[PDB]
Design an enzyme around this catalytic site. Structure first.
Site, PDB file in Angstrom:
ATOM      1  CG  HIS A 121      41.493  42.667  18.258  1.00  0.00           C
ATOM      2  ND1 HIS A 121      41.760  43.938  18.746  1.00  0.00           N
ATOM      3  CD2 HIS A 121      42.491  41.862  18.666  1.00  0.00           C
ATOM      4  CE1 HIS A 121      42.913  43.887  19.417  1.00  0.00           C
ATOM      5  NE2 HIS A 121      43.364  42.636  19.370  1.00  0.00           N
ATOM      6  CG  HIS A 151      32.054  44.494  17.087  1.00  0.00           C
ATOM      7  ND1 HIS A 151      31.589  45.394  18.012  1.00  0.00           N
ATOM      8  CD2 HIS A 151      32.086  43.291  17.677  1.00  0.00           C
ATOM      9  CE1 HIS A 151      31.296  44.728  19.152  1.00  0.00           C
ATOM     10  NE2 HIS A 151      31.608  43.437  18.946  1.00  0.00           N
ATOM     11  CG  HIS A 174      32.650  38.602  18.069  1.00  0.00           C
ATOM     12  ND1 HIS A 174      33.831  38.825  18.770  1.00  0.00           N
ATOM     13  CD2 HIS A 174      31.743  39.515  18.483  1.00  0.00           C
ATOM     14  CE1 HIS A 174      33.663  39.889  19.584  1.00  0.00           C
ATOM     15  NE2 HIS A 174      32.402  40.315  19.400  1.00  0.00           N
ATOM     16  CD  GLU A 206      32.434  37.293  21.452  1.00  0.00           C
ATOM     17  OE1 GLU A 206      31.787  38.312  21.844  1.00  0.00           O
ATOM     18  OE2 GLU A 206      33.694  37.183  21.526  1.00  0.00           O
ATOM     19  CG  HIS A 250      28.366  41.671  19.740  1.00  0.00           C
ATOM     20  ND1 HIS A 250      29.535  41.168  20.329  1.00  0.00           N
ATOM     21  CD2 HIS A 250      27.398  40.749  19.956  1.00  0.00           C
ATOM     22  CE1 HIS A 250      29.326  39.929  20.756  1.00  0.00           C
ATOM     23  NE2 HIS A 250      28.017  39.630  20.553  1.00  0.00           N
ATOM     24  CB  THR A 295      33.054  39.422  24.575  1.00  0.00           C
ATOM     25  OG1 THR A 295      33.131  39.979  23.262  1.00  0.00           O
ATOM     26  CG2 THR A 295      31.604  39.321  25.009  1.00  0.00           C
TER      27      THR A 295
HETATM   28  C1  LIG Z   1      36.632  41.272  18.233  1.00  0.00           C
HETATM   29  O1  LIG Z   1      35.866  42.174  19.008  1.00  0.00           O
HETATM   30  C2  LIG Z   1      36.060  43.474  18.935  1.00  0.00           C
HETATM   31  O2  LIG Z   1      36.905  43.921  18.111  1.00  0.00           O
HETATM   32  C3  LIG Z   1      35.295  44.357  19.738  1.00  0.00           C
HETATM   33  C4  LIG Z   1      35.477  45.731  19.681  1.00  0.00           C
HETATM   34  C5  LIG Z   1      34.703  46.554  20.513  1.00  0.00           C
HETATM   35  C6  LIG Z   1      33.736  46.000  21.408  1.00  0.00           C
HETATM   36  S1  LIG Z   1      32.710  47.059  22.461  1.00  0.00           S
HETATM   37  C7  LIG Z   1      33.549  48.700  22.424  1.00  0.00           C
HETATM   38  C8  LIG Z   1      34.881  48.766  23.128  1.00  0.00           C
HETATM   39  C9  LIG Z   1      35.658  49.935  23.059  1.00  0.00           C
HETATM   40  C10 LIG Z   1      36.905  49.957  23.731  1.00  0.00           C
HETATM   41  C11 LIG Z   1      37.384  48.805  24.397  1.00  0.00           C
HETATM   42  C12 LIG Z   1      36.627  47.591  24.434  1.00  0.00           C
HETATM   43  C13 LIG Z   1      35.371  47.591  23.789  1.00  0.00           C
HETATM   44  C14 LIG Z   1      33.588  44.584  21.465  1.00  0.00           C
HETATM   45  S2  LIG Z   1      32.405  43.823  22.555  1.00  0.00           S
HETATM   46  N1  LIG Z   1      32.262  42.257  21.994  1.00  0.00           N
HETATM   47  O3  LIG Z   1      32.972  43.719  23.941  1.00  0.00           O
HETATM   48  O4  LIG Z   1      31.117  44.538  22.445  1.00  0.00           O
HETATM   49  C15 LIG Z   1      34.402  43.785  20.655  1.00  0.00           C
HETATM   50 ZN   LIG Z   2      31.457  41.907  20.299  1.00  0.00          ZN
END
Ligand SMILES: COC(=O)c1ccc(SCc2ccccc2)c(S(N)(=O)=O)c1
Ligand SMILES: [Zn+2]
Length: 258
Positions: free
Chosen positions: A62, A92, A94, A104, A117, A196
């Site tokens: 993602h 990471h 977006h 976002e 983020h 998110t």
């Molecule tokens: C495209 O966005 C991503 O690939 C992504 C990956 C991790 C996380 S936070 C960790 C986390 C661990 C396990 C499950 C969900 C989030 C977030 S966010 N935007 O919610 O901080 C977004």
């Molecule tokens: Zn994020």
């Protein structure tokens, strides 16, 4: 048929697997700068990244995660709106298919080219998995990116992306210093919200810096060469992996600055 940001499994579908998608404290949100209240009780944010230990970079299907060793009190976020100490686990981004979209959070409906983020968990809950079950489990520092002059402190990340082009690829990524991704000012907005991406858990104190960082068109173009697909599958460019603004509902966004 798992969630994503494609034509048939994107943000508008997520509520079917994750009903919390239509919850009371979902993220991101539009930040209405005129409505945000200055809060003179907020403290300066403390970002202590001198001893951060990066380990690895992963294409998670993602986005890409830059992962940190969080087994000791090294890289921590505190102060600001937070009680106690939150430890950096990963960052990471977006981003968009075009420079006019990708963030976002939005500011008076303005969308930036991308958003960084830095995800931290509250050390009173012992680890990340326990922290995400709590309303004050996580603190995510959000930094906008605009396209302009290059960010020299981002280039080490951009250069390694060709080695993790497809879903599930990882690469060693040591000695990366996340202080090189910070703007000059730590003025911020803050509000209670969520992850998110699924599972959309309502466990985040969001801290969104006002001042964006500048990255070059070439740097962002290299993000858009990544792939959502696995090796040996047809190419699905990794672009537009942002969730749109969600209803603010019964929440106040607070500003650290007037
Ligand atoms: C495209 O966005 C991503 O690939 C992504 C990956 C991790 C996380 S936070 C960790 C986390 C661990 C396990 C499950 C969900 C989030 C977030 S966010 N935007 O919610 O901080 C977004
Ligand atoms: Zn994020």
């Amino acid at each position: 048929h798992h969630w994503g940001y494609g034509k048939h499994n994107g943000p508008e579908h997520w509520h079917k697997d994750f009903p919390i998608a239509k919850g009371e404290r979902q993220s991101p949100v539009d930040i209405d700068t005129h409505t945000a209240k200055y809060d003179p009780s907020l403290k300066p944010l403390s970002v202590s990244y001198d001893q951060a230990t990066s380990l690895r970079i992963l294409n998670n299907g993602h986005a890409f995660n830059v992962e940190f060793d969080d087994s000791q009190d090294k890289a921590v976020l505190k102060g600001g709106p937070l009680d106690g100490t939150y430890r950096l686990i990963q960052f990471h981004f977006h981003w968009g298919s075009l420079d006019g979209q990708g963030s976002e959070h939005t500011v008076d409906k303005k969308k930036y080219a991308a958003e960084l983020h830095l995800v931290h968990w509250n050390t009173k809950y012992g680890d990340f998995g326990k922290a995400v079950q709590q309303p004050d489990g996580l603190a995510v520092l959000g930094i906008f990116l605009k396209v302009g002059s290059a960010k020299p402190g981002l280039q080490k990340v951009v250069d390694v992306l060709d080695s993790i082009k497809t879903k599930g690829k990882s690469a060693d990524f040591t000695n990366f210093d996340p202080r090189g991704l910070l703007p000059e000012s730590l003025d911020y907005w803050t509000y209670p919200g969520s992850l998110t991406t699924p599972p959309l858990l309502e466990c985040v104190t969001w801290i969104v810096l006002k001042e964006p960082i500048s990255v070059s068109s070439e740097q962002v173009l290299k993000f858009r060469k990544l792939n959502f697909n696995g090796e040996g599958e047809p190419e699905e460019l990794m672009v537009d992996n942002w969730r749109p603004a969600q209803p603010l509902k019964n929440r106040q966004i607070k500003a650290s600055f007037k």
